[PDB]
Design a protein around this ligand. Structure first.
Ligand code: FE
Ligand code: FE
Ligand code: FE
Ligand code: FE
Lengths: 82, 306, 498, 103, 82, 498, 306, 103
């Protein structure tokens, strides 16, 4: 159920390896990524963190799990604010 | 194997008409290839964003007919004959503008009429632009080229009306430079109570993306309301205020509006060949009528006020 | 008196307002509008440089059509059909088939802008653009219609876009990608800027030059009149482009222009290239395809792109090499597989034509000339089975056109392949592969004609099965050599014993 | 190719492309008259003529009306203006073809 | 055992679909491709026809079968002369 | 009397012969020689423009070394180690580690040409090239050797290339691709032309300028002396390139140059960029990294490429954008993950340095400045856990360097992914992905450091496990902030209650 | 955890030598990182072409030792000391050239000697170039940097000899312009019987790609043959023909040749620490000796002929 | 970027880059003397000096020996010639830095 992704957080300078869980919601995924960015290189801010496939327009629902998303291990995601 | 076949007198799709095809038939019929393949309207990935848009908002519309292509514009207008017709009507309107300006018509209107015009007439450019944008949407989504062509000409007619309104707002400002003419229309459209029913109606109508709902709300609800509650009441008020140009201008605009009503009714008649469509069209009319009624009531109470 | 347009024009485009009953994003959804997050207020500075207004439009367009139709009427008895070189007649057939219903599709690109662009001047100019493309579709159906009674291949002026014929698939994949399948700002950049100030000048003016030389004034007059509208509505692109650059979207703008220009190039190399350098009779070739490319695309179009602040496309040098090579091979492919076309390709390889080709493309005879040598020998020796194909060409998963290269003495061919989501795709250039990778969701489940043949979508699996799948209804409709091989009579005869 | 294409790209030629008809000669003449001390180049392609000057080329309504020999409004030029090189700026009095950059 | 390849023959102008057999030798593959090229657009010539993965340097042995080669269906091959 | 070189030089390279007992291809196998089928006779026109001969070589190279070693000896007591800014000392550590054993690898690139090039002048010049790179490897081990007794990080002058430390992997993947892993003609084009007339001038002369400003003349004198050899043996590339173009191989030549320049760029952006704009003390920055790029790479190198008949690379505009952006992010990555480096990165973000960065790269403070703001706040508030990483960066499958983008106010980041043979690869640019696709057999089963971590090759799976896997032997060897965060003392203090 | 450790006086890999490391040790030892990973010599795909080449021709060589890096050049030469040594020997040779030219040495040789030189001496540039190319091959393939360095200096020495031969061929041509000196050497190398044993030997040796076989054939078979059957016989003939420069020149070249023999013997001694290697080295010597013997015999019969 | 990079690329500057030491001043002086009616530009980077002229720049052995003040052979320049702009052609008498093309 360990599931590696590569994640780019909004306003950060890089993409990082973040190992999430197959059964994680997108809300949970966003939080696991934010851990490695917010208050490290990215200023905290108000708003709702959302997950999308890298460079996509369409956002994954907040409640959707990694398993439900159709994402493959080691694919790239962005975490952005809506 | 393959056959040896002789030439046809017209397009293969018209070759079994009994009548000689008209110019209208030759240049207007069965041109949307995007309806040929239900799974891929456009020649792209079947689930490309625009393919999904068309599968949802055209193909899946509850308004259904097995032969939308057989729809015929009652006026059988093509680009060429539209321009002949409209150059006639528009040269007539431009000649009225010239002549009435020569006679200094705007100076002879009843005291205060410029303020009524600033408030109830000049912001119509926003309303007419909304009709223009909406007509273009029905164009791009309609399931037959003969339907789309009617929408194309209707989109042009909406811009015609917008342009008359722009020209006359400017012209009136020249006689009456202290009325806000050409300066305050956005503020009125956004903030004035008499415009808010109309603004709410159009913002919501422009977000009705199903082709059938777009068509019915625009052409069967919104546009006839404009005729009975905006155009005709303005003609009456103009008569009471010794504005003799506005009634003539509106009469020309009403010719366009009647044409839009004619083709739209013809489309309904075509659609009702499918009995299921009656409840569908009725449902949307009943959905949108209250909003249109509120819009008309708010406008009329503004036109009536001091 | 009348007041001049300059005094009331601004009111005609004072049409933006701040939405209150729905959100800005609901009214202008990104997937349809393509505003890239640029707010409404910023779009109000959009200023179309080539303006018109409703009264002028109806008056002037009335005059444009009066001339086009009058010239047609006056020349009905000029015997263009019966007296023209058949290569010229095939040029008409390929033009009307490839273009007429696509022009009508362009109405939808203009309509997309008229509803969904955040720039008010763009919405109005796009309304005239809708009207213009309606004109172009109607003209380009009306004109060939009179030839239906003479030749079933003219039915394709209407039929092509309703078919799965390979060249029709190529046309639709291009037009559906750049015109009808993307958001309003993409259309503004890709169609009006990239396509309508670029490649349409080749088919509608370059070709008009050849038409005039060929004495076909009905056609020359028609297509040049059409281009006068294009020259106006195409000027919607520049201001969109300048706005995107001003608002931090240069990179996005450049990518879209780069993509659209390449996509247009490959289609025009298959349509216009063989027309200009092979189907048009030698005496009527005003300039070569490459000379016209240097005039219209390099000298005019690309110079305009630089003036507006964009860069030369990354693939510049590949493009220049392609201009020297690609259409010669596409011509070869279309001619060898002529039975799959709705027009009759002229081979265009008589000695005098080969001398011209050598002058215009030094080295031609040691390259394409090698293949035409084998073909010519076969024709002269009546070995006709060897001049017709018994398999399919491999086809690009972007352009939908055969995968080609340079034949003969310095043979070079390259296919650019890609695995994506557990499927293997093949492209005719680095640039085509790059286009796919820019937007895979647009393309990923599309199947080209070869993919369909291999998947069992084309039944039966024979030349005949494919031809029927492609919409052919009779022997008469399928392409033949334009001159029924009478061109071999100008080649040195193949001697036999006496 | 390289040298040939570079030379083709690095031009500053601007001006109208006029479609065969009654505007060809009047536009050529107007280009000459309205741009004194600009050399005007003309390339004849029978179906169209390519008229150009370096950097800027103006056509005034008044000159065009004189050279054409009949009443003429500037907007009417679009009946015959098939294309153009340069950016365009047009009003009731004249049309200007121009470039912002020098290549 | 039908096996589609896309093949580019030496001195020809295009790549073509050629359906071979899984159990075909490279000698047999080359011949099946040559059918659609030699004496059609390519002059016949002396020499041994060889098969390679497209744009490769390394040639497949003459005796090797399609099955043995590791080629996947619809991959591109060249047929050249050694 | 002695006879001048011009009179007997031709005999020194009259060494080609026609093989009889083995074939030409057996003696010069394409996989090692890279002759692209060009026959022996054609290679005899190869004419190296920068010649030498054995007696001159040994005499002159004796003098070069006498000077380099004498200056070292005379300056041993200048207290460079103890008195230099630690950012300067880290520059020495990163230089010798990244370069010394790679120079010795370059012997093999030269040896590849000395045995396998079909051009006799190339085989002789490459023999001097072998000798030159031997000199460079030996100098660049001897020089740092004396610092071993002072600082374990100098052990990496020898150790780096024997490690799996991430930057060492990046260096080896580059050098093994362009120097030791390809045929002789590829080496001639890629190493000597692309790399040795291009990027080495930045690290060996640009950096020499900064060294002289910093008062480190031993180092400035050393690296400039080394470059005098490079300037001679690099002139093997031009004649190879001209020969390939003359023999119909322009396209192949251009592709190799394009590939090698980009590969060199990404490595040099991670090594030299942070050195020039951050580690070198502000007072010693002769020019910015970008200014030096414009001098050496744009103004000199690319102009030379055009003079020899090549085209600007297709990615020109991407490259220009990268020069403004890439190294700022690579610096950030190397500093944040400093514990994985064998040198101590200087942050280089005191207010006075930030003013300089803004001057040299307008907009810097609203981009990278945003990240350094957060970092600076944490340092001032003693929130040190937030200045050290708890995960891995994602890494390019070509360059072996973190995947980065522009941070801050106009955030933009892009990863260019590729599926190939049922594996997913990720690249830091369009160009890196393109390089992979040019030669997949070179790269396809290579695993980057992240791929290894995910595959269970790095045990245990922790910062510590990775650090040990990378060859670190003590706390002292792993990178720290150069100034132990004393730079925060120049930032406005974070106030607390009294 | 991680330790805190103190600095080492030298490289970590030398830190447990008892002696203070020399310049030679510091700059020469254990520099081929390509031997670290048996499955991927180079930092590329494990089966990239060059990785396959090195796995086959270096790693899989039957000549095996568990510590090739411990090999030491007996002369412990580095770049710096090679150039000091060779500038000394080469300045000496160049001074001989100058002086003997001043004294018009070439005019005083026995009648016909120029023809012997044209036939048996001037084509040595081809042979020496073959030694140069071969030495470079052993350089790039040898499994230790200390071995490779010896090959680098040997490659330079081969070019030294080639260059002496070029210079002297040209110089002799100035006194004897009608002997084909500097004109006919390729033809002799290709066609002359006395050169064909040597040419066959080198063409085959240059296609022996296993590092061990390359080393043994080049350094233990070919090079010693050159010493005993070419260099020394030429000195004897020169003495008989009153050529007093050639014996002195060859004596300097022989200093180089002896050095190559010294390091090569040291490598054999190192290799024989593994008893398996004796049969391997013996096998290759026995394989190549007949070819070298034929080469020498053909050369000598040409040198002896009229 | 675009304008800046174009200007940087479109130069015809050729000449030696000399590494700090005893050849810096003599080479500057020789460049001036041996190229009369060429403007010589010098950029001082302390560790090296960048010496240039438009299109061609010659350094003769005889001039360099005079400016250096001691016996000098042309090949010895490589002790101090760290890089150069332009193509190179060298013999016993002189070195020539040059371009074939004009940008
Ligand atoms: Fe059109
Ligand atoms: Fe258009
Ligand atoms: Fe080096
Ligand atoms: Fe080097």
């Amino acid at each position: 159920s360990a599931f590696p992704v590569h994640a780019a957080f909004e306003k950060d300078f890089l993409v990082q390896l973040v190992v999430v869980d197959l059964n994680d919601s997108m809300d949970q995924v966003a939080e696991k990524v934010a851990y490695h960015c917010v208050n490290r290189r990215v200023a905290p801010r108000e708003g709702v963190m959302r997950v999308r496939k890298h460079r996509s327009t369409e956002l994954f629902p907040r409640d959707m799990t990694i398993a439900e998303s159709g994402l493959n291990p080691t694919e790239v995601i962005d975490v952005v604010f809506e | 194997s393959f056959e040896s076949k002789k030439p046809m007198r017209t397009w293969s799709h018209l070759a079994e008409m009994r009548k000689k095809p008209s110019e209208y038939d030759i240049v207007s019929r069965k041109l949307h290839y995007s309806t040929n393949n239900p799974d891929s309207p456009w020649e792209l990935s079947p689930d490309s964003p625009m393919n999904l848009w068309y599968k949802q908002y055209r193909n899946a519309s509850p308004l259904k007919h097995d032969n939308w292509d057989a729809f015929t514009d009652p006026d059988q207008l093509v680009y060429r004959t539209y321009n002949l017709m409209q150059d006639g009507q528009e040269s007539y309107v431009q000649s009225l503008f010239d002549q009435f300006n020569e006679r200094e018509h705007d100076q002879m209107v009843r005291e205060g009429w410029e303020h009524t015009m600033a408030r109830c007439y000049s912001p119509l450019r926003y309303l007419f632009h909304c009709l223009q944008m909406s007509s273009a949407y029905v164009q791009q989504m309609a399931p037959a080229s003969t339907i789309s062509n009617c929408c194309i000409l209707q989109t042009a007619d909406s811009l015609r009306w917008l342009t008359h309104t722009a020209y006359r707002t400017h012209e009136l400002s020249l006689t009456y430079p202290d009325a806000g003419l050409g300066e305050h229309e956005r503020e009125l459209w956004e903030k004035e109570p008499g415009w808010q029913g109309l603004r709410e109606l159009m913002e919501k109508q422009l977000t009705a993306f199903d082709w059938g709902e777009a068509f019915v709300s625009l052409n069967l609800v919104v546009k006839p309301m404009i005729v009975e509650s905006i155009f005709k009441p303005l003609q009456q008020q103009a008569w009471e205020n010794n504005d003799t140009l506005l009634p003539l201008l509106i009469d020309s605009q009403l010719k366009d509006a009647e044409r839009h009503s004619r083709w739209s009714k013809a489309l309904v008649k075509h659609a009702l060949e499918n009995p299921d469509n009656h409840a569908v069209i009725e449902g949307w009319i009943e959905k949108w009528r209250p909003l249109a009624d509120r819009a008309a009531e708010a406008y009329l109470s503004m036109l009536s006020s001091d | 008196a009348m007041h001049p347009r300059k005094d009331w024009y601004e009111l005609t485009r004072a049409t933006n307002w701040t939405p209150s009953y729905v959100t800005e994003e609901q009214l202008f959804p990104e997937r349809m509008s393509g505003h890239m997050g640029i707010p409404l207020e910023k779009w109000e500075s959009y200023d179309e440089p080539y303006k018109t207004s409703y009264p002028e439009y109806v008056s002037i367009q009335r005059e444009k059509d009066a001339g086009a139709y009058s010239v047609k009427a006056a020349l009905e008895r000029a015997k263009i059909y019966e007296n023209s070189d058949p290569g010229w007649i095939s040029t008409l057939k390929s033009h009307y088939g490839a273009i007429a219903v696509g022009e009508y599709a362009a109405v939808t690109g203009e309509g997309r802008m008229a509803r969904f662009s955040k720039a008010p001047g763009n919405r109005n100019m796009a309304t005239f653009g809708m009207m213009d493309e309606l004109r172009h579709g109607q003209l380009q159906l009306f004109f060939p219609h009179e030839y239906c009674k003479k030749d079933r291949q003219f039915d394709w002026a209407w039929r092509a876009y309703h078919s799965n014929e390979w060249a029709a698939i190529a046309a639709k994949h291009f037009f559906d990608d750049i015109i009808t399948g993307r958001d309003a700002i993409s259309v503004a950049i890709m169609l009006t800027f990239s396509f309508e100030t670029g490649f349409t000048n080749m088919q509608f003016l370059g070709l008009a030059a050849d038409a005039a030389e060929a004495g076909d004034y009905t056609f020359a007059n028609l297509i040049s009149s059409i281009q006068t509208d294009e020259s106006r509505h195409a000027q919607q692109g520049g201001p969109a482009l300048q706005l995107l650059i001003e608002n931090g979207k240069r990179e996005e703008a450049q990518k879209k222009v780069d993509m659209a220009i390449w996509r247009a190039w490959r289609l025009f190399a298959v349509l216009t290239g063989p027309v200009m350098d092979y189907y048009t009779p030698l005496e009527d070739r005003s300039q070569s395809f490459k000379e016209f490319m240097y005039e219209w695309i390099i000298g005019q179009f690309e110079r305009s792109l630089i003036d507006l602040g964009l860069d030369k496309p990354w693939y510049w040098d590949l493009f220049l090499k392609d201009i020297d090579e690609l259409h010669h091979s596409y011509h070869m492919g279309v001619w060898y597989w002529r039975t799959t076309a709705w027009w009759n390709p002229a081979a265009g390889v008589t000695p005098e034509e080969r001398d011209w080709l050598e002058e215009k493309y030094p080295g031609w005879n040691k390259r394409w000339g090698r293949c035409w040598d084998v073909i010519t020998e076969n024709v002269l020796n009546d070995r006709m089975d060897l001049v017709s194909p018994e398999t399919l060409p491999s086809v690009c998963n972007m352009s939908q056109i055969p995968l080609v290269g340079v034949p003969g003495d310095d043979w070079n061919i390259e296919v650019f392949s890609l695995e994506h989501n557990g499927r293997l795709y093949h492209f005719g250039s680095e640039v085509d592969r790059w286009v796919f990778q820019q937007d895979p969701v647009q393309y990923q489940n599309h199947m080209n004609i070869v993919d369909r043949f291999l998947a069992g979508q084309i039944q039966p699996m024979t030349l005949e099965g494919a031809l029927k799948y492609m919409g052919f209804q009779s022997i008469e409709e399928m392409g033949k050599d334009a001159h029924d091989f009478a061109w071999a009579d100008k080649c040195k005869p193949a001697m036999k014993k006496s | 190719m390289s040298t040939l294409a570079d030379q083709a790209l690095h031009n500053n030629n601007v001006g109208p492309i006029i479609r065969a008809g009654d505007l060809v000669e009047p536009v050529i003449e107007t280009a000459e008259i309205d741009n004194p001390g600009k050399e005007i180049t003309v390339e004849d392609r029978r179906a169209y003529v390519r008229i150009a000057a370096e950097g800027e080329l103006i056509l005034t309504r008044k000159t065009l009306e004189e050279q054409l020999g009949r009443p003429f409004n500037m907007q009417e030029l679009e009946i015959n203006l098939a294309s153009f090189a340069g950016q365009i700026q047009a009003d009731e009095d004249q049309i200007r073809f121009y470039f912002d950059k020098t290549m």
